[PDB]
């Protein structure tokens, strides 16, 4: 495969739905050496498995939130690993009241708390492995359209993967230097813990399906493979850029019509809606 | 004028060539009566005779690291003017380190001080006086081409006023069943207090000057006007928008070297660089 | 007014709901003397009255496809009014056939007709007065979120407007150099002459209104507005700019729900379509 | 490979160092079965090997501004080949003159000829191979970022790529109901028949290794990984997208400075220039 004897870390798994997971699974294929961090021993209890099934034998914790565990990964990867050629970073959160209402209520503590776990431990995992990072590494984090567009209720997680994009672009200039290449995959709305914990989010994903271009929702298989492919030295042209796997969906300056011209109507208006 | 009998609040003015000001000015000569807003005792010795200047008695304290002051704030307009048409938020912090060197050695307290001071703010500001805000209230904030582009050593700053852009897109949708709007000028680097204590900010300024399309840097004037504008009833149709006052520099995918044919040279090269 | 003492041509008046008027009326309030341009005969019927109505005697016969129309109304404007102080270039056509069903069925024929007459026109209106423009001059086009983004049925157009807003971007280069600005005010639906015969444009409008953050259609007087502000030296420091003016939907990245939020509902399904 | 088993038709190939031919190369690597196109007899004499060495004995010829080349290629790829499952668009041509000197001076023929050899010729190609496009087809073009930003005299070519990518929107659309995909391939400078002909061309190109942030310019291999990933199942979930192959050339806003901070200076003052 095309990352035959390459070896990467992967941060964000939690169960076989984790977009992390598609993408690892996606690596595994292409002959990737892999490892996984996990947040706390209730997670590492779903991590071990996913890890095994990817003839893993490196699972190491990591709470982006607490800098002495980023010092122990330095030092696992170093001993059980030696080198790093890429770097998942699949991570996010924010207390569940931001994500509901509007941005106006946002609390300066959860504001602080999304900004932190979701952008600037990509700053500090990046950092943190540098050193250890080969010529021609490649680091991946992930966004969502939600970052240059108003997407219901993201909110403040808004305004965090507009910071994770421009840091993108920032740390692709830092690196860029020594080879390294930094990248950001936009992928649509999908069924993953995190998501199944959003509010209306069927809905979301059903506005996704009905009016994306492939009119289809994007599989895990299909992040995967994005991410696989940004991963790889396939793209290794490519750098500080975010690229979009949502069907899509993107394209749109409106609701899709297309496929009905009588007088023209809106997909939705035809489609789980009548 | 086109902001006669216009009430609004003017957050961010430490001195005559502030970002702040300049819109202020301009929204002066319009009729607006105007209300300013220093961080500490030592800006209230420069923002006073300022506002004196500008026909203003409403002077008040504001740190937007202090959340007490936001609810005098509150009642110190809800006094004094009872309501607010227009509300400028022209504030933005980093420590120096930041702002040199690489995005990746920033740290986690500098990262949240670049978010809260620069991004948060405007959502406190917002939130706070939003029950004294009048229909067809407008709020201007102020970003860089940093958030989208990547700038020299403008690092953690890039990734604030890209979450800013973010804000005010999702702003514009929370205050707009108000009828309220929110824009953000992207004004082209100029001179001020903040900005003649960053590095090389000489040499930023010379590039964008030879470099944009009207061969020029913007003035504190034009700023304003672009400002005013947003600002007024005149832009009623606009929102959500960053408006760009930069000489048309934005638009460049490579320095300029028009003028100049008989081989092609960059104009840099020709000016201050032979 | 911002525009005392200054000379603009208006170029595509049709009648009293034009765009092209809209800017027209608003510059007039301003100061600014007036010339108009005239499709045919049966427009200048409605080009005339509306000329009158605004102190102006300067009126023209151009038909952009015909290269002598632009050498007299060189001479016209140099004899009639000596120089150009702004252009207003709201000019777009193509066959009804391709505004409707798909860009895929789009003829040869009906691609060229839509690239010449709204977007070339700009290029030859613009190089043929260029020797009259005096400095600081602001040329002023028209486009559409279609541009960037997919609307319904726009097709063609939707590549026109796009070559359109990448001329704006290099004559802005071009022009720069000696002062003159060149912008386009991208403005959300609007009923006008060339929409009502657009297939259920009706719709678009609909939808605009609903979606939109400050929830209603742009009226004939803010498009105005912006546009004699992107015409007046208050944005002088403003060029290349794509000026969104239509009551912040370009910020939207799906339907609206805001408002309801028991469960998160469309405001669409709420609002002309229980 | 992720193409075994996949025909595909070839658009543009010249030499052994088009970017048409790199993608058939990358694309022949993972199993698929070519066909190609030539425009006259003089290119057919480096089509042909070109075609033999990759294996392919579907040679066809195909002259965009001719209509009745479309006809004979249907033919042609229906009774050889039965259908197509991907297709490579990597045509352009503007007249010499359009590219030098300004924007401005371009005339209506030259407007006419960059336009539809560049853009509309998507459009015929896709809808007359339309009913030869199997379930999952990807339709890949070619752009730069003259695009949306403005590029040494790119001019015209600038406007058609807007367009072309504006299309690239449409068509996704249009062709998404039976599920085929359609994106665009932004690559970076890089040494080409077409190219070499262009004025002042090696000066883009240093510009582009010094200021890129992976500071090398990308090889006929990245643009060609690049393009066999977007026509592949492994980018199934994506379409309508301007993917970059720049070395992430993209995202700079200003020149490059970062590795020399003695007073912070232009890697171009250090690099060929003294
Ligand atoms: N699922 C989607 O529709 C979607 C769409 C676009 C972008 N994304 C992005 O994908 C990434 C998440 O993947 P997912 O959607 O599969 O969700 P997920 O729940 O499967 O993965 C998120 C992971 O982050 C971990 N995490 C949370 N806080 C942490 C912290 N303090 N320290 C260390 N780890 C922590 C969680 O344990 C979890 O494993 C996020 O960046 C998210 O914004 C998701
Ligand atoms: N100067 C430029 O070239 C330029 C370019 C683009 C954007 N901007 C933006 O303009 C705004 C500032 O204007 P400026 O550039 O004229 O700088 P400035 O020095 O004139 O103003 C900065 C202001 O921010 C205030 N401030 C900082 N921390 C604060 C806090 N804790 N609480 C309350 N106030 C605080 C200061 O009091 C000061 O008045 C910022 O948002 C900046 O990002 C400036
Ligand atoms: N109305 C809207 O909702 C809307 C939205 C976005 C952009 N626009 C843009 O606004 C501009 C036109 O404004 P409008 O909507 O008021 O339409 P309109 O019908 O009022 O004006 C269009 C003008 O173009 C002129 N025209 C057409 N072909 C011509 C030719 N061959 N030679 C000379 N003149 C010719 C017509 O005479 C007409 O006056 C167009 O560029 C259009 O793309 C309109
Ligand atoms: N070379 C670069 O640095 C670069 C950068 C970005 C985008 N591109 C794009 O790549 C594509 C071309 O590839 P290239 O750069 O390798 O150049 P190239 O010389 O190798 O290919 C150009 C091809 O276009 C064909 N062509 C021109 N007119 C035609 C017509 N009327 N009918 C049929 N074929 C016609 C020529 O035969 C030629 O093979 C173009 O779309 C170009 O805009 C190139
Ligand atoms: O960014 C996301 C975007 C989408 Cl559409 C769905 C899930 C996402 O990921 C998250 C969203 C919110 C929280 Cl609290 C945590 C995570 Cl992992
Ligand atoms: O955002 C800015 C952009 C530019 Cl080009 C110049 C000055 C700016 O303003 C600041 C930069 C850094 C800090 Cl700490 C505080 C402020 Cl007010
Ligand atoms: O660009 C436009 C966008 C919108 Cl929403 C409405 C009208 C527009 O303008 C036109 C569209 C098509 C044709 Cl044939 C002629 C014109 Cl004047
Ligand atoms: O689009 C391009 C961009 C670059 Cl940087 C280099 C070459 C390109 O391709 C062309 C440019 C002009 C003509 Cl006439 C024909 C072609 Cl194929």
Redesign the interface.
């Known amino acids: 495969g095309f990352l035959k004897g390459k070896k990467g870390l992967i941060v964000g798994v939690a169960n076989n739905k984790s977009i992390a997971y598609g993408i690892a699974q996606s690596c595994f294929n292409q002959g990737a050496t892999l490892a996984f961090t996990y947040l706390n021993e209730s997670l590492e209890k779903r991590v071990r498995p996913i890890a095994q099934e990817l003839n893993s034998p490196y699972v190491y914790e990591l709470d982006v939130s607490k800098?002495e565990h980023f010092k122990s990964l330095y030092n696992s990867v170093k001993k059980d690993l030696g080198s790093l050629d890429f770097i998942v970073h699949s991570v996010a959160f924010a207390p569940k009241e931001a994500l509901?209402?509007?941005?106006?209520?946002?609390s300066?503590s959860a504001?602080?708390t999304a900004?932190?776990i979701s952008?600037?431990s990509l700053?500090?995992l990046?950092?943190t492995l540098?050193p250890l990072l080969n010529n021609g590494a490649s680091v991946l984090t992930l966004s969502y359209?939600?970052?240059?567009?108003?997407?219901?209720?993201?909110?403040v997680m808004?305004?965090?993967?507009?910071?994770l994009?421009?840091?993108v672009?920032?740390?692709?200039?830092?690196?860029?230097?020594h080879?390294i290449?930094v990248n950001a995959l936009s992928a649509?709305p999908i069924r993953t813990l995190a998501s199944s914990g959003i509010?209306?989010f069927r809905?979301?994903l059903k506005?996704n399906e009905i009016?994306?271009?492939?009119?289809k929702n994007?599989?895990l298989e299909?992040?995967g493979?994005?991410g696989?492919?940004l991963l790889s030295?396939?793209?290794?042209?490519?750098?500080?850029?975010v690229?979009?796997?949502?069907?899509?969906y993107?394209?749109?300056?409106?609701?899709?019509?297309?496929?009905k011209?009588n007088?023209?109507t809106?997909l939705?208006?035809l489609h789980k809606?009548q």
């Open positions: 800098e509901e209402g509007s941005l106006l209520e946002t300066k504001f602080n900004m932190e952008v600037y700053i500090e990046t950092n540098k359209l939600g970052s240059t567009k108003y997407m219901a209720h993201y909110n808004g305004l965090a993967k507009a910071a994009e421009s840091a672009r920032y740390l692709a200039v830092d690196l860029g230097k080879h290449r649509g509010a209306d809905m979301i506005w009016n994306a271009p492939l009119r994007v599989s299909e992040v493979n994005a696989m492919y030295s396939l793209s290794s042209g490519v750098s500080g850029e690229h979009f796997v949502d069907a899509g993107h394209v749109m300056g409106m609701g899709a019509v297309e496929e011209d007088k023209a809106l939705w208006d809606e």
